[PDB]
């Protein structure tokens, strides 16, 4: 919960250190403190008003390194601090938060595709491994609804997946759910009201503009209006009852486009542009900081 849409890292020619924040209320962008280490394919999440950047990879000319890092950004100080690292590097990770605890899901390390899952306890600054998923998944979308964690699509190393599964923390156990109608790796996955949305992604042939949503009560996936741009490795968040998708790759260009989905009207609209095109960002929402620089 909060007021700005923060976008951390990403990729354009090489992995990026940018931390920028968009204010839907006035259309303004702020540049904040860079990440300590560039990273794309990371996830962002917020707990207790702090922004966490999780996993990813630094794709650079001086060497490509998969990240096990968990770093914390304090909007009150405009500073990043390192937290305890995960058990393993996880590029193209998915992350969700249940009851103040951060779940790191899947992702890759070199040629290995993780089924493993681990949980962060901020109060103790400690990671612990939980039950692994039923399927190895990288480029996996993750969202939380009703204190259950969902892992949606991805890539197992051989095929892009339409499959999805759901984790019950009290049983430390994953269960398959209805697969999506479309195979999607690198989709934006997020929750709006009673529904898990999976927007865009790559089906192994094309970047996608289609968007489908899972109703947890009916156990079905239904397509809604498609986005204006096909995009994979997009950033996604929810703010005041609307979905926002940020950047991505459309098979031609690294997008700067930010689109807003209104569920009331079932329409996607262009709302703003990032200061530069990029894919594989981590995105989350929290309170405004105090001493940034406004982007002209």
């Amino acid at each position: 919960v909060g007021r700005l849409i923060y976008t951390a890292g990403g990729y354009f020619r090489q992995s990026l250190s940018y931390l920028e924040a968009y204010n839907p209320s006035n259309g303004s962008w702020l540049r904040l403190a860079d990440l300590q280490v560039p990273r794309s394919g990371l996830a962002g999440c917020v707990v207790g008003g702090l922004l966490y950047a999780v996993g990813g990879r630094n794709n650079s000319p001086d060497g490509n390194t998969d990240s096990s890092a968990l770093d914390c950004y304090n909007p009150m100080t405009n500073q990043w601090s390192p937290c305890a690292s995960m058990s393993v590097p996880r590029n193209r990770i998915g992350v969700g938060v249940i009851d103040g605890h951060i779940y790191a899901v899947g992702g890759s390390h070199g040629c290995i595709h993780h089924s493993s899952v681990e949980r962060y306890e901020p109060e103790r600054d400690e990671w612990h491994l939980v039950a692994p998923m039923l399927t190895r998944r990288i480029g996996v979308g993750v969202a939380v609804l009703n204190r259950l964690l969902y892992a949606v699509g991805g890539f197992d190393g051989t095929n892009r997946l339409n499959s999805a599964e759901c984790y019950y923390p009290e049983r430390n156990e994953w269960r398959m759910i209805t697969p999506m109608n479309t195979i999607r790796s690198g989709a934006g996955v997020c929750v709006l009201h009673n529904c898990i949305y999976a927007a865009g992604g790559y089906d192994g042939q094309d970047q996608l503009n289609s968007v489908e949503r899972y109703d947890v009560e009916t156990e079905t996936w239904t397509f809604v209006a498609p986005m204006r741009h096909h995009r994979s490795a997009l950033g996604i968040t929810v703010h005041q009852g609307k979905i926002y998708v940020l950047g991505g790759y459309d098979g031609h260009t690294f997008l700067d486009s930010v689109e807003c989905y209104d569920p009331d009207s079932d329409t996607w609209s262009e709302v703003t542009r990032m200061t530069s095109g990029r894919s594989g960002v981590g995105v989350a929402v929290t309170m405004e900081p105090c001493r940034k620089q406004i982007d002209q």
Partner: peptide
């Protein structure tokens, strides 16, 4: 990888 356009 290719969804990032890497």
């Amino acid at each position: 990888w290719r969804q990032d356009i890497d």
